[PDB]
Amino acid sequence: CPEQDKYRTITGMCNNRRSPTLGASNRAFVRWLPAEYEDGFSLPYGWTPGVKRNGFPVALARAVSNEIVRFPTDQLTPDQERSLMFMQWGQLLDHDLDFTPEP
Amino acid sequence: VNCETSCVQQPPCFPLKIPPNDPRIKNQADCIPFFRSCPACPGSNITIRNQINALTSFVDASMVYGSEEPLARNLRNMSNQLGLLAVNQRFQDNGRALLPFDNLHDDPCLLTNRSARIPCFLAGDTRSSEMPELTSMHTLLLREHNRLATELKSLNPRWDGERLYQEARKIVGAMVQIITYRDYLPLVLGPTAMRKYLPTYRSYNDSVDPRIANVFTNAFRYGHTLIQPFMFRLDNRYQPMEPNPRVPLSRVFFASWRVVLEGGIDPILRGLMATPAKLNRQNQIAVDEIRERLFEQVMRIGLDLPALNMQRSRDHGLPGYNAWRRFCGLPQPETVGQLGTVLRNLKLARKLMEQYGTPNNIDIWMGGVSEPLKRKGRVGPLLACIIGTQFRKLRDGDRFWWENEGVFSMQQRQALAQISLPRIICDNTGITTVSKNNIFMSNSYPRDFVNCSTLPALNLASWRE
Ligand code: HEM
Ligand SMILES: Cn1ccc(-c2cccc(COc3cc(N)nc4nn[nH]c34)c2)n1
Ligand SMILES: [Ca+2]
Ligand SMILES: [Cl-]
């Protein structure tokens, strides 16, 4: 860490001088609550057929989508007080904050 | 093994199985492809599985510059000491810049159109090409960097190639913070949460952890509910620019050819400012373009984005709805009656309670988007908390935050506060009729539209050396 600095680093490194990898790139997400898994450490809920979550069976995301997210597109209520640019900046800002890499 | 074509559940695959009597997939053996998120610790049985953020949590405009040193260089125009960002040397938008092209093996953009043979673009974020409306914002921000670099070069010709890039970068990131917290966030939270989770900024705090919370990644996907099933292209008179003025979203994903060979950024931005966003309603959550036809042009099957969000939250081992309500100090519904009261919709409470069994098991995005919106805000109290809590941390925990003492002068700060995204559109496009402040509210032409002259530009006089 340099004693005096005029600009930001490219990796976010050194923004916090005490914990220099805080907010920096290619580092683990902070957790605001402990993680919740089938085995308690790795396997996601839904993983093992049979295994229930908090006493209840694990609902398929596709089924939750089919039954709670689906509607006929012709019925779409347009927002009066919001532009499509509002939806668009959120994505642009999100892409400044997080990217969970996959294999 | 190969999540892309295989429906077997061997790591790193976690494929989404098809339920009986599915509206689209009649093949039960088939499934939605899924690649588990990368572990911060591969193979360990001691650490509780966590995931990586490949980006700088900071509102520093890393989607412009890059969050990795090699990509920060292979994005700059190294041929001159004008410190600009490199551009497309093969294509232009009425003489104006276009983001450069990226060398890719498995290029998704090329599969949207064989005949055009237009690949993905190259920005500080791999997702720049995912949609032309996003390519538009990306193209605008790069243009505004070279535009600032030039306006600073003529002001201080005694400045080198590095100083120019850094000083325009500084200003860019600051404009991202200004539009985020002053314009975007109040219209996300509403006035109530905006005063609770984001009170008047005091000064930088080194004891505030500026990382992104594992939850924020799934929670901030609330925007999926604001998705319009078409890309809206508009002429210089804000009228349906033909051919293809309402192009279905399943034919716009990755289609980079639509920017280069179908009008450029200008018709996309006009249509962005003038078209209303989709309204999240308890019975109308997200569109079937993203729910049935996601990346349909580039994949063996179209994905279901709202479902991906849910499986992803399980992959990230996220605690359900009730855990987060508590985290936020909000009541925790335990039954359909209680949830009915929480959601202010018993029909939804019953449908969710049928799927989940208890609201404890309700996947964070599912429960967050199901909640009724705040006053003047586009989320309920749970997402307002998660989102708000995170943005508080990214502001007070940012040592290069625009308002912080030393980043900019008393003078530059005065200059910077005059900036707005319409003004950014005025200077980087051939668009003259612009969204009258607030850009994110304004959605009807000409009722909420003004001219480029009626907007003050950013004075870079305080920047002189
Ligand atoms: C263009 C329309 C959009 C599409 C097609 C889209 C698509 C996606 C997809 C496919 C993912 C990864 C899904 C997964 O496999 O887990 C994703 C993640 C994400 N999206 Fe969206 N999205 C869009 C708009 C937005 C909007 C409007 C927002 C918020 C304002 C947003 C916020 C997020 C966030 C936070 C993530 C996780 C990012 C990460 O860390 O990797 N998205 N989106
Ligand atoms: C290096 N590399 C690995 C994967 C990619 C890549 C590039 C463009 C789009 C996509 C899929 O689409 C999204 C993924 C995501 N994690 N978040 C998003 N938000 N909107 N769309 C999103 C993945 N690049
Ligand atoms: Ca960043
Ligand atoms: Cl190029």
Resolution in A: 2.8
Nearest residue (by CA) to ligand 1, atom 15, is: B308
Asked whether the beta carbons of B423 and B402 are under 8 A apart, the reply is: no
Q: Tell me the C-alpha distance between B50 and B58, whole Å.
A: 20
Torsion over CA: B142, B143, B145, B146 (sign): positive
Three-state DSSP string of B396-457 = HCCCCCCCCECCECHHHHHHHCCCCHHHHHHHHCCCCEEECCCCCCCCCCCCCEEEHHHCCC
Helical spans, DSSP H, in B3-131? 62-65, 69-73
Atom of ligand 2 nearest to the CA of A95: 19
Confirm or reject: Cβ of B127 under 6 Å from ligand 2.
yes
Tell me the three state secondary structure of residue B232: strand
- B439: which chain A residues are within 8 Å (Cβ-Cβ)? 83, 85
How many CB atoms sit inside 10 A of residue B86's CB? 18
Burial of residue B445 (CB within 10 Å: 0-12, 13-18, 19+) is middle
Q: Is B194 on the interface with A (CB under 8 A)?
A: no
- Cβ(B349)–Cβ(A64) below 8 Å: no
Spell out where chain B is interrupted, by the residue before each break (C to N > 2.5 A).
Answer: none
Residue B433 pairs in a beta bridge with B451
C-beta of residue B412 within 8 angstroms of C-beta of residue B174? no
Using the beta-carbon criterion (under 8 Å), do A97 and B59 form an inter-chain contact?
Answer: yes
Pocket of ligand 1 (CB under 6 A): A 87, 90-91, 94, 98-100; B 130-131, 217, 220-221, 223-224, 226-227, 290, 305, 308, 312
Collapse the DSSP code of B121 into the 3-class scheme (helix H, G, I; strand E, B; otherwise coil) and give the result: strand
Domains and CATH numbers, chain B: 1-465 (1.10.640.10)
Helix B336-343 / helix B346-356 crossing angle, nearest 10 deg: 130
* Ligand with an atom nearest the CA of residue B91: 4
The Cα B210–Cα B153 span in angstroms is 33
Instruction: Show which of residues 104-133 on chain B sit within 8 Å of chain A, judged by CB atoms.
Output: 125-128, 131, 133
DSSP B47: S
Q: How far apart are CA A12 and CA B69, in angstroms?
A: 11
Chain centroid to Cα B252, Å, comes to 16
Residues of A in contact with B304 (CB under 8 A): 61-62, 65
Q: Is residue B399 a contact partner of residue A16, using CB atoms and an 8 Å limit?
A: yes
CA of B318 to the centre of ligand 3 (A): 23
* Contacts (Cβ under 8 Å, ≥6 apart) of B65: A10, B72, B75, B124, B169
**What Cα–Cα distance (Å) separates residue B246 from each residue in B198, B376, B434?**
38, 29, 20
Overall residue count recorded for chain A in this entry? 103
B414-B415-B418 Cα angle (round to 5): 95
Cα of B162 vs centre of ligand 4, distance in Å, is: 22
Question: Which residues constitute the domain of residue A60?
Answer: 1-103
Question: A66 CA to middle of ligand 2, Å?
Answer: 24
Question: Determination technique for this PDB entry?
Answer: X-ray
* Chain B residues inside the 8 Å CB shell of A83: 272-277, 435, 439-443
Angle, helices B266-274 vs B132-153, to 10°: value is 110
Structure tokens at A82: 């919001």
Dihedrals phi, psi of B208, to nearest 5 degrees: -105, 110
The whole-angstrom separation of Cα B302 and Cα B297 is 8
Q: Does A73 touch chain B (CB under 8 A)?
A: yes
**Window A:19-38, CB contacts with B under 8 Å:** 19, 22-37
CA–CA dist B359, B461 (Å, integer): 57
Q: How many domains does chain A have?
A: 1
Instruction: Classify residue B66 as exposed, middle or buried by CB count within 10 Å of its CB (0-12, 13-18, 19+).
Output: buried
Alpha carbon B371 to chain centroid, angstroms: 21
Angle subtended by helix axes A84-97 and B132-153, to nearest 10: 70
Continuous H helices in B230-356: 257-260, 266-274, 288-291, 305-315, 321-327, 336-343, 346-356
